[PDB]
Write a protein that binds this ligand. Structure first.
Ligand SMILES: N=C(N)c1cc(-c2ccccc2)c(CNC(=O)c2cccc3c2OCC3)s1
Ligand SMILES: N=C(N)c1cc(-c2ccccc2)c(CNC(=O)c2cccc3c2OCC3)s1
Ligand SMILES: N=C(N)c1cc(-c2ccccc2)c(CNC(=O)c2cccc3c2OCC3)s1
Ligand SMILES: N=C(N)c1cc(-c2ccccc2)c(CNC(=O)c2cccc3c2OCC3)s1
Ligand SMILES: [Cl-]
Ligand SMILES: [Cl-]
Lengths: 228, 6, 228, 6
């Protein structure tokens, strides 16, 4: 679809789409850029993430509204429409996972890029898990856990405790534990140790990195305040 | 709902 | 596309889509309902209007962002992407105008329904006019004016001055005059006489209708405050 | 920008 457009033009248009709040376009442009087969820069990885996070975020919010209405109802229309939204959401998740598997992850040698992509893999299996009920919920959950876990292992070995990707990964793995895996103590433990180890590393940072790191620490704090 | 990396 | 779904199911799903903030789905469901060929109720007309207003509203907001960036630039990517958004917006406007012409307007006998649809026709030609530049801008503008004018004539004859459709029509025709037709004095005159004649009719209303009417009067006031 | 019937 985007095969005839230059990689640089796709990136340029992804940035324009972001400015215009056109996130479905943004995602299509970044999918096209990925499919050119070259590795993505830090900025380009963030564009990919922003685009699909916003697309799937709208779908998740809609699915939750419909699922709640469906539950309250204990005709077939509510179920049909929830299924329609669910199938669209699963399709987006499948597309992202397909990009990671073909071939972003295998070509990511650096810790920064490999952790970023493995976090994404965990996130999009997590979104699949939120709507899963069939013979594959358990396998979907374990796929999310495995991706998050490999990202955690690399990030702990290769990144400082205040690195924003490491922090955002730990935040989301903690949400996985609490919301998906029915492991609230694991969730609380991870959020707390991540928060404390970041705090102890802030003294090494510039004013700019300090702001970057403390922003995500605030989200860890917010969840601990919700959970304890 | 808890916060994930917005 | 929606041909196989029951009319009642389409309406039900349009309301669900609204609750889920899924306005493109909402519009597709209401397009399907219109294409069943039966007249639309007051509630159903509002569902149609809400759906397409929200869809085209996002497109207009995006187009304005891109057009401003394009102007600031005085490669082809910005123009290409603005054109992409513009073409999509024009397609939505054309779809709505096609529904009105096939055959909502001709089957609308009541003043309430006929004014509603003619206001919509004015609105969607106005949105076409916002992006028009070719040999047809003047004809597009005159198509908007003609539709608004016929709606005004009927509404003045058949509806009280506080009727919310009459008020919203006058508000939007006034915006047409100011923004599209380069007629700011006509715009100001229309907003003021509409506001004053509504004020003088409020004494006839219930508490509920009073709130309905004063809400739109506040928007007339806001524009007069911007313009005078 | 002026307000139209939201
Ligand atoms: N277009 C967008 N929405 C973005 C473009 C870039 C970008 C990245 C690199 C170079 C230029 C721009 C973003 C940053 N992304 C992050 O995750 C991030 C979050 C917190 C703190 C920091 C981060 O990175 C460096 C420090 S966001
Ligand atoms: N299950 C646990 N790990 C905890 C049990 C208690 C506790 C509470 C009351 C009495 C006794 C123990 C905890 C106290 N909160 C923290 O330390 C904390 C640390 C960092 C950030 C935040 C925190 O709270 C909200 C935001 S954490
Ligand atoms: N689903 C939606 N978003 C809507 C459904 C209905 C609806 C209409 C009729 C019956 C039941 C519901 C809406 C009302 N629409 C208006 O234009 C309007 C605006 C201001 C004041 C009044 C109005 O109508 C009566 C009084 S909005
Ligand atoms: N071109 C015009 N028609 C006007 C000229 C002047 C004017 C201003 C200053 C000095 C002399 C004249 C006007 C004064 N505003 C109004 O009457 C009015 C009425 C209803 C609601 C609102 C109003 O204002 C903001 C909101 S309206
Ligand atoms: Cl459906
Ligand atoms: Cl384009």
């Amino acid at each position: 679809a985007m095969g005839s457009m230059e990689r640089a033009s796709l990136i340029q248009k992804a940035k324009l789409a972001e400015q215009a709040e056109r996130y479905e376009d943004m995602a299509a442009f970044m999918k096209g850029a990925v499919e050119k087969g070259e590795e993505l820069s830090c900025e380009e990885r963030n564009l990919l993430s922003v685009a699909y996070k916003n697309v799937v975020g709208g779908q998740r919010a809609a699915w939750r509204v419909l699922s709640s209405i469906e539950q309250k109802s204990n005709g077939p229309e509510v179920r049909e429409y929830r299924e329609k939204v669910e199938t669209e959401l699963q399709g987006v998740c499948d597309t992202v996972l397909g990009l990671l598997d073909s071939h972003l992850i295998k070509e990511a040698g650096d810790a920064e890029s490999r952790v970023f992509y493995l976090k994404m893999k965990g996130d999009y299996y997590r979104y699949l898990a939120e709507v899963a009920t069939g013979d594959d919920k358990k396998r979907i959950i374990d796929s999310a856990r495995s991706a998050y876990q490999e990202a955690m292992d690399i990030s702990k070995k290769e990144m400082p405790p205040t690195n924003p990707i490491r922090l955002g990964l730990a935040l989301n793995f903690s949400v996985f534990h609490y919301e998906i895996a029915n492991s609230p103590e694991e969730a609380i433990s991870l959020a707390k140790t991540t928060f404390d180890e970041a705090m102890a590393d802030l003294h090494t940072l510039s004013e700019d990195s300090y702001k970057d790191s403390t922003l995500i620490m605030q989200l860890l704090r917010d969840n601990l305040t919700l959970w304890t | 709902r808890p916060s994930s990396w917005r």
